[PDB]
Design a protein around this ligand. Structure first.
Ligand SMILES: Cc1cc2nc3c(=O)[nH]c(=O)nc-3n(C[C@H](O)[C@H](O)[C@H](O)COP(=O)(O)OP(=O)(O)OC[C@H]3O[C@@H](n4cnc5c(N)ncnc54)[C@H](O)[C@@H]3O)c2cc1C
Ligand SMILES: Cc1cc2nc3c(=O)[nH]c(=O)nc-3n(C[C@H](O)[C@H](O)[C@H](O)COP(=O)(O)OP(=O)(O)OC[C@H]3O[C@@H](n4cnc5c(N)ncnc54)[C@H](O)[C@@H]3O)c2cc1C
Ligand code: SF4
Ligand code: SF4
Ligand code: SF4
Ligand code: SF4
Ligand code: SF4
Ligand code: SF4
Ligand code: SF4
Ligand code: SF4
Ligand code: SF4
Ligand code: SF4
Ligand code: SF4
Ligand code: SF4
Ligand code: SF4
Ligand code: FES
Ligand code: NA
Lengths: 291, 149, 184, 138, 653, 374
């Protein structure tokens, strides 16, 4: 299994521990990660897709060409990047007018998308190709904690193009998290948005925090010890959002936020130092005393 | 054309009569045994493959015999001599394209006993030289008489 | 009171035009299949805590109320795709909202924060670029001091800068290359 | 300037009805095809298809009942065996496989018929004209 | 004889003329060889158009006619009658489809639509030249009818045909007749018990001198054509002698096996030995062997000793002239609309499950209770359009009856329990027939039933109480509602019955986009199918209510009675025949026929193929596969199709 | 005709032609039943063959007479939108294809007899009373369109550009008085903006019609599609309460009307229609119930989707047959479900719109159902 690793922005430049965790976890599961030299912002669809669809797709196609030139598929650990590149790719394969538009612009740079790139999400790649059983085989330290699983919206949706099963009652992440020994607690409005998507975090911060607060509150009521996501954007919203909720509304939860690769990492027998948990706005130390 | 047929034609014109060619396909004249239930082909064989039964119809045995899409009159010496008909007398008066009609017939009876389940890709893959199999003597008179380049 | 003089009969067609060829004429023209059932509004996470009503956006597009382009409400959509997924008339709701946002952006209705994020992607190539603390954090956990990304490749940074100029995205956000910042 | 010349063979019970349904529904599609009615796709054979190419067809379309839905129980199974051989015979004659298209379209599948006509027109239009008649007239 | 053609281009008002330049197509037809006269008229099928054709056939001594208009599948029979009245053989007439196949699909390309119509006219003219005069095949009609499905529609067809004096066979799949109507408590708009209208009809159909009822039976095979159908009916084994059984029900009281009753939609239980419902007809019992353990307790109790475990199924062979399909429908399974929680939440039920709960003789004794705790719900929500008007489930049609049955069942709940809060979440209230709008007014005015215009986004259960919350926008207030209910009823739509695919194959009939059976024409022939001798009646033709179903059953009886009363019908002479002078007996044709019409015979001391005219349906498969050209089907000869192909590119000579 | 959008002629004209030449059908056109005595199986009927003042046997329907007639009479078939002559044929595809003279307006100038080759005109012709014995009677007298003059706030009969949907059917008809052109009656111009007002004379207690007329949602969407086919730039709005597209292919026809033809729908029953005296344009006052705002959009033409009411002659037929009426005033079936086409009077059946508001598919089904019952 050889895949071009799209990093994005938030993971490599801020929550770099997610990158280290993914690198090791994917190596342990028989996956070779190749560098996408020159890869830029996916670009973030919240701003780019809302500002100009033409510019979002052209820059997304530019990044798809980098993996196409290498002759490998793409793998990402972000719903934002997954949604941006997967939907960009699907559109260039399905719509000839959109492909022709983009290629006229890409021709000015010396690139041309040909439609041979497949975009994968590591959680989906783990479930469908590798197998959940292979996760459990590599568990060195079983995690005896309750996890508030946050799928995020851009992982399974739009279902018409993603084809990763139901986005209403999914089981994918619940089984991957449970392989580590953790328990995926059912909580109210489990499939709702964290509130950051569509550039809402930046434009309407209070609105985004109201939704994050609802999710955190619901997870806590369900006995969750932490939250697990598959998106640095969700991660930032749950982690930094808690500081912003404390500052604006005075509500304190001290609810640890982890990316699935970091959770998997701990179970694989990784040193929490490599996971860069000290970079998190909300300390994960209380959770480390429970695992 | 057999000598006797050439004489009959010329003799008819000498007598101010209209020449009449035989109208049927070769199976009537052929001495091979045909099944009352009809033709059913299980597999397609090249002329060198297997060992043909000298009494049973060669088409029923899986060999491409053009007798079905060829006018009678020759006496069917080829099947009688142990080899399938190559269709050298050409088609009947009711068939313009001999090869097209032969292909139609062959495709229809191929796997007819397992009609709904026979894989339709078997026959095309079995015949490596389609034009040479069905148009040895009549390519120029076919609907598509050339290879486009 | 709403008069015919207060409406734009071509609003829907103008939204479809903007959505052609990306995300597609078929995709954005789906707004014409809406039968105002409200499934989108009841599914909206943002509508539960604001005055935002998803079907009113589609209603205003069909009715011709162009004030929808000046609306703060269209920017409350998180693009969760729940409306898109549940619409019984196959209206590609989330895509129509994004296309409406494109016309709102063209008219100047863009937030500084979004314009700042767009500027970081053309200048540094990334919405969240690397800082001095990144280099320190990355090397401390076994990673390369600098990630193999556009931020450190003048080749790829120039490629994007050529595309941004060809698309006119620099003019859209109001970015000047001599000044090296967002004008006005 | 040039518009492809397409000929269609549609069975009365299903595809001819499917073409009728597209019409009743005002489902627009390109005006290159001219449909010929037959009672069953089982009536179609290589001679008719090859005859269409000789006359100047850039594309040939054949529509029948879904496998198992033939009005005459199994006529479409015979046609399916014939068309598979025909695709390869055409390639040997230098006629692109893609200039022949066969589909199973029911009596009410107007949308499918419409989209099939659009797709087949774009495929022939992209291939350009068939030069058979140009070469035979020389 | 040299052909003399008359070409007639129709405008169909503006349906053709608005896109295609008909007068130009008419002048083009005049340039074609053998065209003596060419004319265009607004409506060729109308009186002036038909007389115009008949006049020219006589006046210009025409021997061929071409009509460039609609599809032959619509008016080929009408123009055939028209030309035959003027003395022209009906098979010397050819249709050019320039409406469905041209004007209606090339509206935005008028110049190319016109060019195309000219080619289609030249193609019809080309085939016309080589058409031959043929004679319609006169066939006898067996004086007997077959009705498939013993529901309200099927019972009506059988009672009407029987009342006219025709022998009729009524086949019913389950142990009893009655259909879904029997499962309903009351019926809108009168609010009569379904029993009131149905039970007397079930009683009558089971004792009718001209009706042979085959309950617990299925049609397993149908061969033949109009007036001459050969049918095989599988009388399934009840493992009880109907002649000896008295339906006393003593056996069911002692049976130890409990099986979920299918009639009660998985709410109520029954025994391995059972009767679908107490008013079932025939009033006989049945043993379900899937669950029967052969304990023998029912036989000790059975006085007439009617129980017979060794009983085997019987295949009955019947000859019939006409067939009526009245297999009804099945309720949509809302498990797929996951946001509503059907199959997850206990208190989310379908409207058909409610019909059984509310029914006086139902499993709860007419009590509407929650499954979670067996309590009576004080607050109920009805969710409309479940599995209808929905592209996500693939059902973009209106199920017709769900607005009315939700308002009806809501009235019943108010009659039984006036304090109950009832809300109906709808998009459009479709109370469109006689007394329906009034029933809707009365539901709100007299019964206090509330209506929320808003399609719900989702249903959510409170895990501690089992109560449900309905998330929906009140579109008339522009606000989001989150009302709590004790029970949620999904007004499920109608889908074809599970066995519809089996019946479709047996009869050889088509389906409309909604998947229900297809009528020949929505207005020309609403209960006929394109397959002669096969008709439709009831919900299997499309979602509808009882009044409409009964009307269709009566309409299907009239349509099916025509060929029976006539005692003779004409069938198309498009049959295959061998030219014995060309056939050398290669045997290629024999196995290609599904009906075995071609046979190798000996004529003049030589083997030759010969077609049994009666077994040939006219598909054209063996002529297409004949390598000698000896086989030709009339009206679709190779030479006729060859001319038609040439016609697209050029004129003859 | 919806939902197929076939010409009404396509399905009807061949059936009219067939019924007029059927060996077992005796067609008495321009005739009325004036008396019915007896009971089931033994009815004695008197049919008055009204005088056309033209010999049907000699007449060839050439129409030369109508070109020279000096009397102009409003065409009833064209709903007052067209003028016809004293000597006339209802429509060009009429069956029997014979002419008739309207004596109420005929002045006996004699010009038509001068152009009548077969000399078929006969002013001395008298009506004939035919006596027939029948076993069963089927009533299929149809319906009449509601007269919206009573809903005064809509301005029908006051404003020139306010028309009924049945008047539109005639304006839009290829063989209509305008040659298939939808024009304003004020200036003869084609309207660029049209409004359809639903439930006119239906679902209304103020006019005494609390029933649904069944077909007006579908015919408003249909006629709106035809206007879009003829003139794509036309702005069309349908003011409705509920869209009742309930039968096979109807919901799809409604989806298609909006998606393919761009027809707009306003959920709101209009309060009133107001004319601008200077332009003849109309304004429709209505609340968009889905926005909670009041609309006052201007239109060049307003079409009232009038409901169905019993035919004018229904009272005469009711008395002759001895049958009852339901609260909607249409004829009463023995039982909505037990016997939908029978009446409580044995030997008398019902078929079509006279039994209640319905569409063509339903009417044809009832005609077939009544044939079985009779
Ligand atoms: C919840 C609900 C409430 C309703 N309420 C009303 C109401 O109040 N008023 C109203 O008018 N309508 C109502 N309807 C609609 C009504 O049920 C139908 O209009 C009516 O039952 C149609 O009758 P049918 O004979 O066409 O079909 P069905 O009633 O479905 O009967 C079909 C019959 O055919 C049999 N059958 C099926 N397959 C085969 C086979 N392969 N071989 C032999 N037999 C077969 C079945 O066993 C059954 O007996 C309601 C529908 C639902 C779902
Ligand atoms: C504007 C409008 C548009 C419509 N569009 C459509 C559509 O697109 N599709 C559709 O399906 N339906 C449509 N409808 C409904 C459709 O017109 C009716 O369903 C249909 O005409 C009913 O047929 P009928 O024979 O029962 O009644 P009618 O068509 O009214 O025929 C009744 C006949 O009986 C005759 N008659 C009356 N009184 C007497 C008497 N005393 N003695 C003898 N004869 C008498 C009349 O002259 C008439 O010919 C529309 C209705 C309207 C008003
Ligand atoms: S062998 Fe060739 S020719 Fe002789 S019978 Fe079989 S097919 Fe006809
Ligand atoms: S090949 Fe020529 S000779 Fe030999 S059998 Fe066939 S036709 Fe007769
Ligand atoms: S859901 Fe689809 S149809 Fe219902 S309102 Fe929202 S968009 Fe319009
Ligand atoms: S996508 Fe935008 S609008 Fe549709 S639901 Fe999520 S947020 Fe509300
Ligand atoms: S035998 Fe089978 S059926 Fe008769 S009682 Fe014992 S179990 Fe119930
Ligand atoms: S079986 Fe014996 S017992 Fe059960 S009912 Fe029929 S008769 Fe009475
Ligand atoms: S009847 Fe009422 S509920 Fe049933 S589908 Fe049609 S509209 Fe929705
Ligand atoms: S296929 Fe043609 S030739 Fe062979 S037997 Fe049948 S008819 Fe005679
Ligand atoms: S034509 Fe079709 S049906 Fe008639 S015989 Fe040949 S194969 Fe059998
Ligand atoms: S039906 Fe066919 S023939 Fe009659 S008018 Fe419409 S098109 Fe011309
Ligand atoms: S006579 Fe009466 S009818 Fe003849 S023209 Fe003079 S007016 Fe018209
Ligand atoms: S003129 Fe004489 S014939 Fe010609 S129409 Fe008038 S009446 Fe009938
Ligand atoms: S059908 Fe539509 S318009 Fe006609 S009354 Fe019922 S609702 Fe009003
Ligand atoms: S009838 Fe359509 S393929 Fe046989
Ligand atoms: Na009986």
């Amino acid at each position: 299994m050889k895949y071009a690793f799209f990093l994005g922005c938030i993971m490599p430049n801020r929550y770099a521990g997610v990158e280290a965790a993914t690198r090791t976890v994917m190596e342990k599961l028989g996956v070779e990660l190749v560098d996408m030299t020159g890869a830029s912002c996916c670009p973030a669809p919240g701003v780019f897709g809302s500002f100009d669809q033409k510019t979002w797709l052209t820059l997304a196609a530019r990044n798809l060409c980098i993996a196409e030139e290498m002759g490998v598929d793409i793998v990402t650990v972000c719903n934002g990047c997954y949604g941006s590149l997967f939907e960009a790719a699907h559109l260039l394969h399905d719509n000839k007018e959109a492909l022709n538009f983009v290629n006229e612009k890409l021709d000015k740079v010396g690139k041309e998308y040909k439609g041979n790139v497949k975009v994968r999400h590591f959680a989906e790649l783990i479930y469908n190709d590798i197998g959940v059983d292979k996760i459990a085989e590599k568990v060195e330290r079983p995690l005896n904690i309750n996890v508030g699983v946050h799928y995020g919206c851009h992982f399974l949706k739009p279902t018409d193009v993603k084809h990763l099963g139901s986005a209403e009652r999914p089981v994918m992440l619940d089984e991957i998290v449970e392989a580590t020994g953790a328990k995926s607690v059912p909580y109210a409005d489990k499939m709702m948005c964290c509130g950051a998507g569509g550039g809402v975090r930046a434009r309407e911060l209070e609105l985004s925090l109201d939704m994050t607060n609802e999710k955190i509150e619901n997870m806590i009521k369900a006995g969750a010890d932490c939250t697990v996501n598959v998106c640095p954007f969700c991660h930032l919203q749950f982690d930094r959002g808690q500081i912003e909720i404390k500052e604006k509304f005075g509500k304190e939860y001290n609810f640890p936020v982890l990316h699935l690769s970091q959770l998997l990492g701990l179970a694989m027998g990784m040193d929490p130092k490599d996971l860069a948990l000290s970079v998190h706005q909300i300390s994960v130390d209380p959770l480390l005393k429970k695992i | 054309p057999n000598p006797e047929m050439i004489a009959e034609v010329v003799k008819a014109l000498l007598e101010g009569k209209e020449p009449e060619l035989p109208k049927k396909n070769l199976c009537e004249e052929c001495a091979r045994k045909k099944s009352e239930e009809g033709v059913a082909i299980e597999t397609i064989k090249r002329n060198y493959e297997g060992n043909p039964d000298p009494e049973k119809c060669l088409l029923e045995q899986g060999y491409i015999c053009l007798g079905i899409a060829t006018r009678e009159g020759c006496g069917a010496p080829c099947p009688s001599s142990g080899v399938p008909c190559s269709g050298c007398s050409g088609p009947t008066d009711a068939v313009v394209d001999q090869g097209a009609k032969m292909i139609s017939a062959l495709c229809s009876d191929f796997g007819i006993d397992n009609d709904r389940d026979v894989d339709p890709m078997i026959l095309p893959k079995s015949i490596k030289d389609k034009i040479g199999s069905f148009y040895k003597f009549t390519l120029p008179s076919a609907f598509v008489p050339i290879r486009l380049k | 009171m709403i008069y015919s003089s207060d409406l734009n009969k071509n609003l829907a067609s103008q939204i479809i035009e903007a959505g052609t060829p990306i995300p597609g004429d078929d995709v954005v023209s789906s707004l014409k299949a809406c039968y105002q059932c409200g499934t989108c509004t009841g599914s909206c996470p943002s509508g539960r805590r604001t005055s935002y009503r998803t079907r009113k956006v589609i209603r205003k597009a069909l009715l011709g109320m162009d004030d929808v382009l000046d609306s703060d409400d269209i920017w409350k959509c998180t693009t969760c795709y729940t409306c898109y997924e549940r619409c019984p008339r196959d209206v590609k709701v989330t895509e129509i909202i994004k296309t409406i946002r494109n016309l709102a952006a063209q008219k100047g209705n863009m937030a500084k924060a979004h314009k700042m994020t767009a500027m970081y992607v053309l200048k540094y190539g990334h919405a969240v670029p690397a800082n001095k603390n990144t280099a320190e954090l990355r090397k401390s956990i076994g990673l390369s001091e600098k990630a193999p990304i556009a931020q450190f490749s003048e080749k790829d940074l120039n490629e994007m800068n050529t595309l941004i100029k060809e698309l006119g995205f620099d003019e859209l956000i109001g970015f000047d290359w001599e000044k090296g910042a967002l004008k006005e | 300037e040039w518009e492809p010349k397409i000929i269609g063979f549609c069975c009365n019970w299903c595809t001819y009805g499917g073409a009728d349904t597209a019409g009743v529904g005002r489902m627009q599609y390109p005006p290159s095809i001219r449909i010929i009615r037959v009672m069953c796709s089982g009536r179609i054979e290589p001679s008719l298809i090859l005859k269409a190419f000789k006359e100047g067809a850039d594309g040939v379309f054949v529509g029948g009942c879904h496998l198992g839905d033939c009005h005459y129980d199994s006529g479409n199974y015979k046609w399916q065996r014939r068309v598979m051989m025909l695709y390869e015979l055409l390639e040997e004659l230098g006629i692109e496989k893609e200039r022949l298209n066969h589909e199973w379209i029911s009596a009410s599948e107007g949308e499918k018929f419409q989209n099939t006509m659009k797709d087949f027109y774009n495929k022939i239009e992209a291939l350009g004209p068939c030069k058979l008649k140009e070469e035979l007239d020389k | 004889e040299e052909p003399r053609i008359g070409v007639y281009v129709c405008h169909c008002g503006v349906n053709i003329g608005g896109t295609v330049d008909c007068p130009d197509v008419t002048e083009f037809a005049k340039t074609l060889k053998n065209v003596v006269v060419a004319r265009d008229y607004k409506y060729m099928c109308a009186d002036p158009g038909q007389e115009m054709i008949k006049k020219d056939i006589k006046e210009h001594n025409l021997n061929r006619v071409v009509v460039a208009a609609c599809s032959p599948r619509l008016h080929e029979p009408t123009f055939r009658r028209c030309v035959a009245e003027a003395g022209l053989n009906p098979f010397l007439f050819e249709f050019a489809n320039i409406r469905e196949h041209c004007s209606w699909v090339h509206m935005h390309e008028k110049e190319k639509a016109t060019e195309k119509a000219k080619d289609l006219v030249r193609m019809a003219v080309a085939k016309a030249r080589l058409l031959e005069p043929l004679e319609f095949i006169k066939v006898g009609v067996t004086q007997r009818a077959l009705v498939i499905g013993g529901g309200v529609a099927g019972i009506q067809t059988a009672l009407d045909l029987g009342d006219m004096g025709f022998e009729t066979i009524l086949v019913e799949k389950t142990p009893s007749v009655g259909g879904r109507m029997a499962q309903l408590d009351k019926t809108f708009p009168t609010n009569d018990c379904s029993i009131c209208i149905l039970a007397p009809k079930m009683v009558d159909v089971a004792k009718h001198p001209n009706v042979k009822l085959y309950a617990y039976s299925e049609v397993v095979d149908v061969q033949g054509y109009v007036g001459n159908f050969k049918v095989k009916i599988m009388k399934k084994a009840r493992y009880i002698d109907e002649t000896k059984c008295t339906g006393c029900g003593q056996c069911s009281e002692v049976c130890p096996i409990d099986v979920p009753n299918e009639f009660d939609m998985g709410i109520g239980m029954r025994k391995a030995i059972y009767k679908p419902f107490p008013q079932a007809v025939p009033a006989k019992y049945t043993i379900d062997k899937e669950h029967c353990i052969e304990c023998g307790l029912c036989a000790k109790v059975c006085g007439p000793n009617a129980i017979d475990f060794d009983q085997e199924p019987e295949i009955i062979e019947a000859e019939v002239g006409t067939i009526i399909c009245a297999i009804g429908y099945d309720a949509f399974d809302p498990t797929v609309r996951e946001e509503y929680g059907y199959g997850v939440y206990d208190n989310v039920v379908t409207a058909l499950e409610l019909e059984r709960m509310i029914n006086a003789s139902g499993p709860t004794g007419g009590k509407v209770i929650r499954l979670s705790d067996g309590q009576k719900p004080k607050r109920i929500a009805f969710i409309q359009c479940v599995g209808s008007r929905d592209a996500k489930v693939g059902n973009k049609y209106c199920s017709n009856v769900c607005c009315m049955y939700a308002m009806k069942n809501s009235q019943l709940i108010k009659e039984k329990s006036p304090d109950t809060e009832i809300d109906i979440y709808y998009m459009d209230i479709r109370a469109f027939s006689k007394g329906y709008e009034e029933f809707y007014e009365r539901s709100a005015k007299q019964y206090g039933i509330k209506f929320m215009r808003g399609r719900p986004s989702q249903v959510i259960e409170d895990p501690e109480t089992g109560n449900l919350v309905v998330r929906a926008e009140d579109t008339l207030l522009g606000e989001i509602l989150e009302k709590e209910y004790d029970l949620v009823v999904l007004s499920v739509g109608m889908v074809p019955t599970k066995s519809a695919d089996e019946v479709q194959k047996i009869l050889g009939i088509s389906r409309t986009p909604d998947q229900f059976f297809m009528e020949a024409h929505p207005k020309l022939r609403p209960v006929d199918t394109a397959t002669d001798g096969v008709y439709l009646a009831g919900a299997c033709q499309g979602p509808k209510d009882i009044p409409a179903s009964v009307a269709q059953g009566s309409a299907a009886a009239s349509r099916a009675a025509i060929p029976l009363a006539k005692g003779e019908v004409e069938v198309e002479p498009i049959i295959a025949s061998v030219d014995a002078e060309i056939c050398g007996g290669c045997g290629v044709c024999v196995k290609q026929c599904p009906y075995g019409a071609p046979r190798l015979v000996e004529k003049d001391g030589k083997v030759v193929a010969e077609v049994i005219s009666a077994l040939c349906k006219g598909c054209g498969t063996c002529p297409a596969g004949c390598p000698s050209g000896a086989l030709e089907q009339d009206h679709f000869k190779t030479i006729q199709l060859f001319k038609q192909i040439e016609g697209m590119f050029r004129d003859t000579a």
